[PDB]
């Protein structure tokens, strides 16, 4: 689980640009800023290679 | 769950904001596609299970 990957973000990356900020992306209109099943979900996920 | 009904939806427009903005205690563990890029582009042959 040490390897993590981001699939959720507001905008695309410019070429040769690194993003390290971990801010929860809000699918809903209201920025609730709180971890939940759907609202204000964590942006980057972790793999489970086995 | 043993006799999970399959519902096919076609010949209309499927707005996902209604699901996002109602019944707040739901989980959205979608795989392979982001809700924002679900909204901007689209697909065909809507299949819904329950």
UniProtKB/Swiss-Prot annotation, chain B:
Protein name, entry field: Spike protein S1
Subunit annotation: Binds to host ACE2. RBD also interacts with the N-linked glycan on 'Asn-90' of ACE2. Cleavage of S generates a polybasic C-terminal sequence on S1 that binds to host Neuropilin-1 (NRP1) and Neuropilin-2 (NRP2) receptors. Interacts with host integrin alpha-5/beta-1 (ITGA5:ITGB1) and with ACE2 in complex with integrin alpha-5/beta-1 (ITGA5:ITGB1). May interact via cytoplasmic c-terminus with M protein. May interact (via N-terminus) with host bilirubin and biliverdin, thereby preventing antibody binding to the SARS-CoV-2 spike NTD via an allosteric mechanism.
Function: Attaches the virion to the cell membrane by interacting with host receptor, initiating the infection. The major receptor is host ACE2. When S2/S2' has been cleaved, binding to the receptor triggers direct fusion at the cell membrane. When S2/S2' has not been cleaved, binding to the receptor results in internalization of the virus by endocytosis using host TFRC and GRM2 and leading to fusion of the virion membrane with the host endosomal membrane. Alternatively, may use NRP1/NRP2 and integrin as entry receptors.
Top-level taxonomic group: Viruses
Covered range of the whole protein: 350 to 399 of 1273
Annotated organism of origin: Severe acute respiratory syndrome coronavirus 2 (2019-nCoV)
Lineage: Viruses, Riboviria, Orthornavirae, Pisuviricota, Pisoniviricetes
């Amino acid at each position: 689980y040490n390897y993590l990957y981001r699939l959720f973000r507001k905008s695309n990356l410019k070429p040769f640009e690194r993003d390290i900020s971990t801010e929860i992306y809000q699918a809903g209109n209201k920025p609730c800023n709180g971890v939940a099943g759907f609202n204000c979900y964590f942006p980057l996920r972790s793999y489970s290679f086995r | 769950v043993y006799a999970w009904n399959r519902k096919r939806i076609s010949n209309c427009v499927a707005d996902y904001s209604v699901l996002y903005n109602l019944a707040p205690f739901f989980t959205f563990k979608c795989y392979g596609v982001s809700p924002t890029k679900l909204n901007d582009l689209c697909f065909t042959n809507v299949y819904a299970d329950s």
